[PDB]
């Protein structure tokens, strides 16, 4: 068996778990983008890419067991559900949390705006390259990836252009411009800084905890700070296992997932290597919820929103990433970056039309709203009386006219018949509204 | 001393339609041997040596400097900058080929070309709304009888004296 997981997860622990079950595990770089093009027996990733994989047909639908369904949390099953069928086996629920240094600061900042001042006392930094870490601050003030109405996602509407998203991104670029956070830093640099205690506070998921546990520096985990009185709403990730459609060992991989990995011993061996967070298995989660860090993770998950599993997600991410970079490095303004993300999210646009709209937004930002409206219109456009009967000696026929009074109609028809040389007896039937003239 | 350096020798003079206004020795200006036109109305240039003093700065073309005078009629005097008929103060103008003229033309400076009605003395109009020549509305959109009210000076280095860039400062007391 071949397993692909991210480089920051517990690859070693999964290796021993597979060894107890041969099983081979690898951690290739950029596996979320390598998987669609290459096609590994099973891949562990967040549920957002799994919907796109299922639409492309790369993931084989798994036959579940009702007892197995009852053994795990139901909302995880709903999250890994696409069009009413289950495409993956949930493993863990991971959400971002604020990890601060106890020695550097007694209590975490309650609001985002306090963070600048605190920072200028030290003279906060995290991963800015990936939009997963930046998104909570953008979405704190109403920004949404896709409108969720009556349980369904509206692809036609994208909320990355809301005034809340603009406010969040302009606050973040103000933090960057105040020399408070490095624009070029990534996950690895942020981790290295936090182990050495250079930075007081950071945003990270459960998986990083073990590494900090190796640095033996005291760390406190809590909810992300509120933005303008509104809490940050981080995307909730469901780290799940997807079985490849072309897997020659589909049944073996399914049995390994059901009976060996998703067990108390398997989860406790994996979590020791790297903290998975809120696990999907009920008993281990109950035995682990006593740890305050899992409680903070679950609180952040409750405050935040789970990632959609629609196939229009990955492209979205790319757009947002670009937007964040366009705001992080100062190459272009916040509003322009959000307009570019909105353009890039549109699925039906041809490459030439998309490039044209990108150029039009580049060279004139004064009418950006009208450009976006026309682009959205293009994207939607490319989405795949009284009657007379005369019986004379010469003419026989009929004629209909518009008259309000019967007397007026009979006078008009008398004039018409005289005009046509008809002179004879007249009869009228009001039931059928017919003037019958004959000789 | 009064800051005449900020006024006369400033690198940047605004267009005449948005002429610069500033609030405040004159014999040095009278005999500076650098001033092409220095004409004073209501006062003697040599007897200047006053509670309110205002300096107006703009750049026009050569054959329109005579429009900066009381009682004159013309595009600069009508739709750009009008002086009162009882004006007490005066006008200075000098050639600015070396500074204001750039090879290939200098089209930065502007003047207002259309307006619904003439302008009262001592006021500045900065509005840049579409002018209506006819009766149909423009809705801030050009078209037939819808014209942009501003126009640029083509201050090429090869232009004659009549069309050369003149810098004009008006000292009103």
């Amino acid at each position, epitope marked *: 068996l071949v397993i692909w997981i991210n480089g920051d997860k517990g690859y070693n622990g999964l290796a021993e778990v597979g060894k107890k079950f041969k099983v081979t595990v690898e951690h290739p770089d950029k596996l979320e983008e390598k998987f669609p093009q290459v096609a590994p027996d099973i891949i562990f990733w967040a549920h957002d890419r799994f919907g796109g994989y299922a639409q492309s047909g790369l993931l084989a639908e798994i036959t579940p067991d009702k007892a197995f369904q009852d053994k795990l949390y139901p909302f995880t099953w709903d999250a890994v559900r696409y069009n009413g069928k289950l495409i993956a086996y949930p493993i863990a629920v991971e959400a971002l949390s604020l990890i601060y240094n106890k020695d550097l600061l007694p209590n975490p900042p309650k609001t985002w705006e306090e963070i600048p001042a605190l920072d200028k006392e030290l003279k906060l930094m995290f991963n800015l390259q990936e939009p997963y870490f930046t998104w909570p601050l953008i979405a704190a003030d109403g920004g949404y990836a896709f409108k969720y109405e009556n349980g369904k996602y509206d692809i036609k509407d994208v909320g990355v252009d809301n005034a809340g998203a603009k406010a969040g991104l302009t606050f973040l670029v103000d933090l960057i411009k105040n020399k408070h956070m490095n624009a070029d830093t990534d996950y690895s640099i942020a981790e290295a800084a936090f182990n050495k205690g250079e930075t007081a506070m950071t945003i990270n998921g459960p998986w990083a905890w073990s590494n900090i546990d190796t640095s033996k520096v005291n760390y406190g985990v809590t909810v992300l700070p509120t933005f303008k009185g509104q809490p940050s709403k981080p995307f909730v990730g469901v780290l799940s296992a997807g079985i490849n459609a072309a897997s020659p060992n589909k049944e073996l991989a399914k049995e390994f997932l059901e009976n060996y990995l998703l067990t108390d011993e398997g989860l406790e061996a994996v979590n020791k290597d790297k903290p998975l967070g809120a696990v999907a298995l009920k008993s281990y989660e109950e035995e682990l919820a006593k740890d305050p860090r899992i409680a903070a993770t679950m609180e952040n998950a409750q405050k935040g929103e789970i990632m959609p599993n629609i196939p229009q997600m990955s492209a979205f991410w790319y757009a947002v990433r670009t937007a964040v970079i366009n705001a992080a490095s100062g190459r272009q303004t916040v509003d322009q970056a959000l307009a570019f993300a909105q353009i890039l999210i549109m699925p039906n646009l041809t490459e030439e039309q998309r490039n044209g709209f990108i150029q039009s937004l580049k060279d004139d930002p004064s009418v950006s709203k009208e450009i976006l*409206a026309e682009a959205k219109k293009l994207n939607e456009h490319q989405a795949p009386t009284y009657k007379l009967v005369i019986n004379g000696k010469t003419l026989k026929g009929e004629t209909t006219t518009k008259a309000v009074d019967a007397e007026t109609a009979e006078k008009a028809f008398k004039q018409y018949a005289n005009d046509n040389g008809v002179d004879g007896v007249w009869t009228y039937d009001d039931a059928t509204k017919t003037f019958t003239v004959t000789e | 001393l009064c800051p005449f350096g900020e006024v006369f020798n400033a690198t940047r003079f605004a267009s005449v339609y948005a002429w610069n206004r500033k609030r405040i020795d004159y014999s040095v200006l009278y005999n500076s041997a650098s001033f092409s036109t220095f004409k004073c109305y209501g006062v003697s240039p040599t007897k200047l040596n006053f509670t309110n003093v205002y300096a107006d700065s703009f750049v026009i073309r050569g054959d329109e400097v005579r429009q900066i005078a009381p009682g004159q009629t013309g595009k600069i005097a009508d739709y750009n900058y009008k002086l009162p008929d009882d004006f007490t103060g005066c006008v200075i103008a000098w050639n600015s080929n070396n500074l204001d003229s750039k090879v290939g033309g200098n089209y930065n400076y502007l003047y207002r070309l259309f307006r619904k009605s003439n302008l009262k003395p001592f006021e500045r109009d900065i509005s840049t709304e579409i002018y209506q020549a006819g009766s149909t509305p423009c809705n801030g959109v050009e078209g037939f009888n819808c014209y942009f009210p501003l126009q*640029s000076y083509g201050f090429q280095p090869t232009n004659g004296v009549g069309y050369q860039p003149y810098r004009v400062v008006v000292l009103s007391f």
Partner: nanobody
Amino acid sequence: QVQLVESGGGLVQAGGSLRLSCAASGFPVYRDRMAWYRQAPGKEREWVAAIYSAGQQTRYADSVKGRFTISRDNAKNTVYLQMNSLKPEDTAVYYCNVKDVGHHYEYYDYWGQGTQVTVSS
């Protein structure tokens, strides 16, 4: 002295895009107004877009607001009209235009040769 030469355009399918260029010689592209007009075969020449140096930077006709845009480049002395979501109604000859008065308030409306844009369907 003043010369306006248009380039670009040609034939594009409905919904495509184009970038008309107007190269200007004899005057800097940063001036009072540079505009783009369209003329259809058998209709009257009408105004499409314009870029100014004062007030609102760009103005557009009602029928082409959003789809079109106009920008200027000082380094190459050019005006670019980017046309997106083109429709068969946009089939016309486009001229870049300036208004320069010589000396006597008889402003010579300087036009270019014009480029044909045919938006097929």
